[PDB]
């Protein structure tokens, strides 16, 4: 679990979004596994605007932060689940590192701020949904 709170927005994995999130929907994209909902309180997370390929992510299944080199956002095939059929998830970045399903929502950060959130994993790999291109989260 986990979310990004920036201004009046909450960013979560679309597969983990609650009834509240859907009832206060701003934007959702199944192909990215992202959903943004409106909030009443202020969010102070800073979103990174960059092309960094190194950062640190939070891994709840280990209660630890790990440094990673990750790939540029791209279309990567994702195996079927109780949330989605087999498909290409876009805006996805992979890194070598530990992850388990409950790790989704853990934040990936670089020196410039929040980069994305854990969305996929398996076989010694961890996949992050990029949020750096969503420039509207700041205005």
Going by the annotation, the residues of the binding site for Zn(2+) are 50, 52, 110, 112
Rg of the chain on CA atoms, in Å? 14
Q: Which of 136, 133, 125 is nearest to 57 (CA)?
A: 125
Tell me, yes or no, if 15 is annotated catalytic. Answer: yes
Which range touches Zn ion (CB under 5 A), out of 5-13, 38-46, 66-74, 110-118? 110-118
Q: How far apart are CA 119 and CA 99, in angstroms?
A: 10
Q: Please report the sign of the dihedral spanned by the C-alpha atoms of residue 78, residue 2, residue 13, residue 110.
A: negative
Q: Are 119 and 129 spatial neighbours (Cβ–Cβ below 8 Å)?
A: yes
Closest separation in Å from C-beta 80 to Zn ion: 33
- Choose the catalytic residue: 33, 45, 103, 130: 33
User: Per-residue x/- mask for Zn ion, residues 15 to 54, rule CB under 5 A?
Assistant: ---------------------------------x-x-x--
Binding-site partner at residue 50 among ligand A1BRE, Zn ion, none, CB < 5 to 8 Å by type: Zn ion
Closest separation in Å from C-beta 126 to Zn ion: 18
Q: What are the backbone angles phi and psi of residue 83, rounded to the nearest 5°?
A: -105, -40
**Please, which residue, 8 or 60, has the CB nearer to ligand A1BRE?**
60
- Cβ–Cβ contacts within 10 Å for residue 17, how many? 19
Closest separation in Å from C-beta 80 to ligand A1BRE: 8
As annotated, the active-site residues are: 15, 33, 104
């Amino acid at each position: 679990s986990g979310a990004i709170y920036v201004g009046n927005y909450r960013v979560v994995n679309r597969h983990l979004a609650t009834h509240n999130d859907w009832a206060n929907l701003v934007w959702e994209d199944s192909s990215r596994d992202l959903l943004v909902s409106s909030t009443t309180a202020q969010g102070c997370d800073t979103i990174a605007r960059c092309d960094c390929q190194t950062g640190v992510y939070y891994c709840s299944s280990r209660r630890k932060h790990y440094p990673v080199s990750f790939s540029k956002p791209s279309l990567i095939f994702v195996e079927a689940s109780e949330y989605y059929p087999a498909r290409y998830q876009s805006h996805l970045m992979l890194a070598v590192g530990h992850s388990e399903p409950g790790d989704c929502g853990g934040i990936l950060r670089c020196q410039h701020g929040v980069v994305g959130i854990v969305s996929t994993g398996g076989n010694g790999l961890v996949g992050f949904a990029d949020v750096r291109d969503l420039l509207w989260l700041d205005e």
